[PDB]
Amino acid sequence: EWKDRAETVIIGGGCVGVSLAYHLAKAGMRDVVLLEKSELTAGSTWHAAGLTTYFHPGINLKKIHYDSIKLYERLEEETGQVVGFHQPGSIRLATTPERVDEFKYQMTRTNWHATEQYIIEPEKIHELFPLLNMDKILAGLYNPGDGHIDPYSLTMALATGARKYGALLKYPAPVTSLKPRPDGTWDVETPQGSVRANRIVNAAGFWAREVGKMIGLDHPLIPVQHQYVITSTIPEVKALKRELPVLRDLEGSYYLRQERDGLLFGPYESQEKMKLQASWVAHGVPPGFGKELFESDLDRITEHVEAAMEMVPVLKKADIINIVNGPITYSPDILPMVGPHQGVRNYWVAIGFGYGIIHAGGVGTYLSDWILHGEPPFDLIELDPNRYGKWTTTQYTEAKARESYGFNNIVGYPKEERFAGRPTQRVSGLYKILESKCSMGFHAGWEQPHWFYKPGQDTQYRPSFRRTNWFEPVGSEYKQVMQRVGVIDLSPFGKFNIKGQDSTQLLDHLCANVIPKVGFTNISHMLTPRGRVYAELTVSHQSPGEFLLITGSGSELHDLRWIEEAAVRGGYDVEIRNITDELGVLGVAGPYARRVLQKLTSEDLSDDVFKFLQTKSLKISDIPVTAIRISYTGELGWELYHRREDSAALYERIMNAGQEEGIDNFGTYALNALRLEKAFRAWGSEMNCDTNPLEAGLDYFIKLNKPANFTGKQALKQIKAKGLKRRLVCLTLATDNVDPEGNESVWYKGKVIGNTTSGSYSYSIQKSLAFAYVPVELSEVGQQVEVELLGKNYPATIIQEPLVLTEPTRTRLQKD
Numbered sequence: 001e002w003k004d005r006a007e008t009v010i011i012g013g014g015c016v017g018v019s020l021a022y023h024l025a026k027a028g029m030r031d032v033v034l035l036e037k038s039e040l041t042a043g044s045t046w047h048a049a050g051l052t053t054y055f056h057p058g059i060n061l062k063k064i065h066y067d068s069i070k071l072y073e074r075l076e077e078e079t080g081q082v083v084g085f086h087q088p089g090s091i092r093l094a095t096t097p098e099r100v101d102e103f104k105y106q107m108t109r110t111n112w113h114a115t116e117q118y119i120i121e122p123e124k125i126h127e128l129f130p131l132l133n134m135d136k137i138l139a140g141l142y143n144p145g146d147g148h149i150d151p152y153s154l155t156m157a158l159a160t161g162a163r164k165y166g167a168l169l170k171y172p173a174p175v176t177s178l179k180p181r182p183d184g185t186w187d188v189e190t191p192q193g194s195v196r197a198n199r200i201v202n203a204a205g206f207w208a209r210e211v212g213k214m215i216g217l218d219h220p221l222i223p224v225q226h227q228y229v230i231t232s233t234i235p236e237v238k239a240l241k242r243e244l245p246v247l248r249d250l251e252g253s254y255y256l257r258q259e260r261d262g263l264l265f266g267p268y269e270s271q272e273k274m275k276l277q278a279s280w281v282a283h284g285v286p287p288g289f290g291k292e293l294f295e296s297d298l299d300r301i302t303e304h305v306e307a308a309m310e311m312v313p314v315l316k317k318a319d320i321i322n323i324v325n326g327p328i329t330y331s332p333d334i335l336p337m338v339g340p341h342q343g344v345r346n347y348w349v350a351i352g353f354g355y356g357i358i359h360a361g362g363v364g365t366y367l368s369d370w371i372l373h374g375e376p377p378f379d380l381i382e383l384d385p386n387r388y389g390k391w392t393t394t395q396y397t398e399a400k401a402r403e404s405y406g407f408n409n410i411v412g413y414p415k416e417e418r419f420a421g422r423p424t425q426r427v428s429g430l431y432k433i434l435e436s437k438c439s440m441g442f443h444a445g446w447e448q449p450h451w452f453y454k455p456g457q458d459t460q461y462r463p464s465f466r467r468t469n470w471f472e473p474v475g476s477e478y479k480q481v482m483q484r485v486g487v488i489d490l491s492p493f494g495k496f497n498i499k500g501q502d503s504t505q506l507l508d509h510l511c512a513n514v515i516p517k518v519g520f521t522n523i524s525h526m527l528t529p530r531g532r533v534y535a536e537l538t539v540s541h542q543s544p545g546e547f548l549l550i551t552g553s554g555s556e557l558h559d560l561r562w563i564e565e566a567a568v569r570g571g572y573d574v575e576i577r578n579i580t581d582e583l584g585v586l587g588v589a590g591p592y593a594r595r596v597l598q599k600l601t602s603e604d605l606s607d608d609v610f611k612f613l614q615t616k617s618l619k620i621s622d623i624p625v626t627a628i629r630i631s632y633t634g635e636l637g638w639e640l641y642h643r644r645e646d647s648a649a650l651y652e653r654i655m656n657a658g659q660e661e662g663i664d665n666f667g668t669y670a671l672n673a674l675r676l677e678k679a680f681r682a683w684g685s686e687m688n689c690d691t692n693p694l695e696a697g698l699d700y701f702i703k704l705n706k707p708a709n710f711t712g713k714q715a716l717k718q719i720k721a722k723g724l725k726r727r728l729v730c731l732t733l734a735t736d737n738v739d740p741e742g743n744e745s746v747w748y749k750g751k752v753i754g755n756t757t758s759g760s761y762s763y764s765i766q767k768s769l770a771f772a773y774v775p776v777e778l779s780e781v782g783q784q785v786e787v788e789l790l791g792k793n794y795p796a797t798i799i800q801e802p803l804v805l806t807e808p809t810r811t812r813l814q815k816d
C-alpha cells in the first residue's frame with residue numbers, strides 16, 4: 001500500500017497533522033496521505049499534559065478551542081475508540097483586584113461568543129476545588145465542560161477516523177526532499193518512495209524549521225523546554241468522588257490538574273530562567289531524538305513549586321513521582337503559523353504550536369475548510385504564517401520566544417506593549433530621531449509612534465484596563481491635527497508595485513471598486529469568492545499600466561499572497577514587486593498642511609491644481625516623493641511616499657518649514673481617534689473574512705455594475721437581494737474612566753445582541769465612540785443599547801455617521 005500520487009501530503013503525524021488528515025478525508029478529499037518520520041505522536045504530542053480549555057484571551061481563537069472540544073466529545077462514538085477526555089471544568093484564579101478586572105475584560109469579550117464562561121465567587125471555587133487555599137482568592141474565571149485529554153488516545157482515535165474516511169498514514173516514512181514543479185505541484189521523497197502531491201502541508205513539530213529549509217524558507221521557530229511535576233497518591237484527593245477541575249494559578253504562574261489520585265502541575269517560570277534549544281536552531285534537531293525527554297531541573301522552577309505548595313496545602317506533604325521536561329515548538333508571539341505560505345505554490349503550514357493539543361481539532365477543520373474552499377471559514381490573520389518576514393531573525397525569534405514563555409500568565413492589559421528583541425532591523429533613520437520623543441509601537445517588525453511625550457507628563461509604559469498616561473497627549477494630538485498640522489510616520493504600510501500588460505485586468509478582477517484612471521487613487525477591496533472582505537487597499541494608478549497598492553501593516557504578505565495567487569491562477573501577465581521595505585511614508589494633515597508643504601516644493605499644491613485623491617510625482621526640498629492627496633485623518637493632507645533612507649531628511653525639512661504654523665507630531669492612537677470621527681472603517685476591525693462589505697457599510701466602494709466579473713460580485717448580489725441580517729453602526733456613550741476599544745458585548749433588554757469592533761474617546765464631543773455590529777431591527781439612528789465595559793453596562797445611542805465630515809466634504813459644501 002503506497003501511493004505515488006496524492007492530492008495532499010501531510011508531513012508529520014503529531015496531533016496536528018493527524019487531525020488535519022482526518023478532517024480532509026472526512027470532508028471527502030481523495031488520496032490524502034500523511035508521512036510520519038517514525039511513529040504517530042513521536043514529537044511533542046506524546047509527552048503533553050493534555051490540558052484542553054475553552055478559555056482563550058484573543059477572539060476567534062475561541063472558535064478553535066470550541067471546535068476542538070466539541071470534536072473531542074464526539075470521537076469515541078464516532079470511531080469506536082476511547083479518548084480519555086476528562087471534563088471537570090477549568091478555573092483561572094484571581095488573587096488581586098487588577099486580576100479581577102482582567103476577568104471582566106475577558107467576560108465582555110466572551111459574552112458574544114457561544115463559548116460558555118463565567119466569573120465565579122470564592123464559595124463556589126471552594127465547592128469545586130475543596131483543597132484550595134481560599135486566603136487570597138477573590139474570584140475565579142470558570143469554563144465548565146472542559147478539562148484535559150490523553151494526547152496519545154486522542155491522536156490514535158483521530159487516526160482511525162482518518163483511515164476510516166480514506167486517508168493513508170505511512171510510517172516510518174520520513175520526508176527527505178521536496179521539489180516544486182512548474183505546474184505548482186510537488187515531488188516528495190521518502191525511503192519508501194516518491195509522492196507527487198498537488199499540495200504539501202508542514203506539520204512537523206520542532207522539525208518544522210528543517211522541513212521549511214528543504215524548500216528555501218526560514219520558519220521563525222525555536223523549540224523551548226517545558227516541565228510539569230506529577231505527584232504520588234494523595235489521601236484527600238483519592239477520598240473525593242468527583243474529579244477536581246483544572247486550575248491556573250496566575251500569580252504563581254502554573255497550571256494544575258488532577259492526575260489519577262494525585263496532582264500534576266506545570267510552571268511557566270521567568271523569561272530569565274526558562275531554557276530553549278538554540279543549539280537545535282543553529283545545527284538542527286539531533287537525529288534519533290524521538291519519543292524522548294530532557295533531563296529534569298526542579299531547581300529552576302522552585303519559586304513556582306512553592307507558590308503551588310501554599311495554594312494547595314496538600315502538595316506540602318506529597319512526594320514527586322515524576323517530572324516531564326520536553327520541547328514545544330514556539331513562534332515569537334506564542335501563536336502558531338496556520339495557512340498557505342506566501343511566495344511559493346501550494347505549500348501550507350500548521351506549525352509552531354504552544355498549545356497543539358487544544359488547537360489540533362479546530363485547526364484541522366479550519367485548514368481543511370481553507371484548503372477545499374480557497375478561503376478561510378473565519379478570520380485568523382493573527383495566525384497567518386506570513387505575519388513574519390526577513391526581520392524575524394533567529395536572534396529576534398530566540399528572544400521573543402523566551403519572553404512569550406515567561407509572560408504566559410502575566411496580566412494581559414489592553415494595548416499591551418512588549419520590548420524584547422526590539423528594535424528589529426526594520427526601521428528608518430526616523431527611529432533614531434523620534435524614539436526618545438514618543439512611545440514606539442511594534443507592528444510586524446516596525447517601530448511606529450503610538451503617542452508623543454508631553455513636557456510635565458509621565459512618559460513610561462503604564463498599562464491599564466482604564467484610561468492611562470496617553471489619554472491627555474492623545475487629545476492634544478487630536479487638537480493638533482484639527483487646528484494646525486500634524487506629521488505622522490505611516491511607513492509600516494504594505495506597498496506593492498504592479499505593472500505588465502494585464503495589470504489593469506488583474507486588479508479589475510481582484511477588487512470590487514473601479515480601477516482608477518492614471519493620476520488618481522481610490523480605496524478598493526479584495527473580496528473572497530463568498531463575498532468576505534479579504535483586504536482593503538488604496539490603489540494608485542501612477543503611469544498608464546502601472547500601480548501602487550497600499551495596505552495595513554498586519555496585512556502585507558497576506559494580501560500579497562492572495563494577489564500573487566490570482567495572477568498565477570488566471571495566467572495574468574504581470575510583474576508584482578513588494579516594495580514595502582524600500583519606502584517610507586509620511587502623512588501631513590490638518591488645515592495648515594498645504595501652507596506648510598507649499599513652502600517646500602515648486603509643485604503647485606492649490607485646491608485649484610491638486611485635487612483630493614490625485615497622485616503626482618514631485619520633489620520636496622530636492623527629495624523625490626510621490627504625493628497623494630489623502631489622509632485617514634479625513635482632514636486636509638497628503639501622504640508622501642519616498643525612499644527609506646530619505647525619511648529623516650524629509651521629516652527634518654517638513655518640521656522646520658512648519659515652525660510658524662506650530663507643526664507637531666502625531667501617532668496612531670490619535671489617528672484612530674480621528675478616523676473613527678469620520679466613520680472610516682479599518683480592515684481587521686470593522687471588516688475582514690468574517691464580514692461582507694455591505695453589512696460593514698462599504699457600499700460606496702463596491703461597484704456591482706462594473707463590467708468585469710470580480711471575485712465575489714455574484715455572492716454579493718445574492719446577499720444584497722436576500723437582505724441584510726445585521727449592520728455596522730456608530731455608537732456614542734458617556735463613561736467615567738474607560739473607553740471601548742472593540743470586541744465588547746452589546747446588550748439590549750437583558751440579552752447580548754452583538755459586539756463592538758473598535759472604539760475611542762471622541763475629544764470633540766466629550767464622549768466615547770464605538771463601531772458595533774447589531775441586528776438590523778436595532779440599527780436606527782437614535783436606538784438605545786448597553787455596552788459592557790469592564791463589568792459595567794453603559795448606555796449607548798446609535799448616531800448618524802459620520803460624526804464629523806471629511807475636509808473634502810466640508811470644502812465642497814462651502815461652494816454650495
Ligand SMILES: *Cc1cc2c(cc1C)nc1c(=O)[nH]c(=O)nc-1n2C[C@H](O)[C@H](O)[C@H](O)COP(=O)(O)OP(=O)(O)OC[C@H]1O[C@@H](n2cnc3c(N)ncnc32)[C@H](O)[C@@H]1O
Pocket residue numbers: 011012013014015016017035036037038039040041042043044045046047048049050051052173174175176203204205206207211226227228324325326327328329350351352353354355356357358359
Ligand atoms: C513538552 C510539553 C508540551 C505540552 C505540554 C506539556 C509539556 C511538558 N502540555 C500541553 C497542554 O497541556 N496542552 C496543549 O495544548 N499542548 C501542550 N504541549 C505542547 C504540545 O505537545 C504541542 O503543542 C503539540 O504536541 C505539537 O503537535 P504537532 O503535531 O504540531 O507537532 P509534534 O506533536 O511534534 O509532531 C510532529 C511530528 O512530525 C514528524 N516529523 C518530523 N520530521 C519529519 C519529516 N522529515 N518527515 C515526516 N514527518 C516528520 C515527527 O516525527 C513528529 O512526530
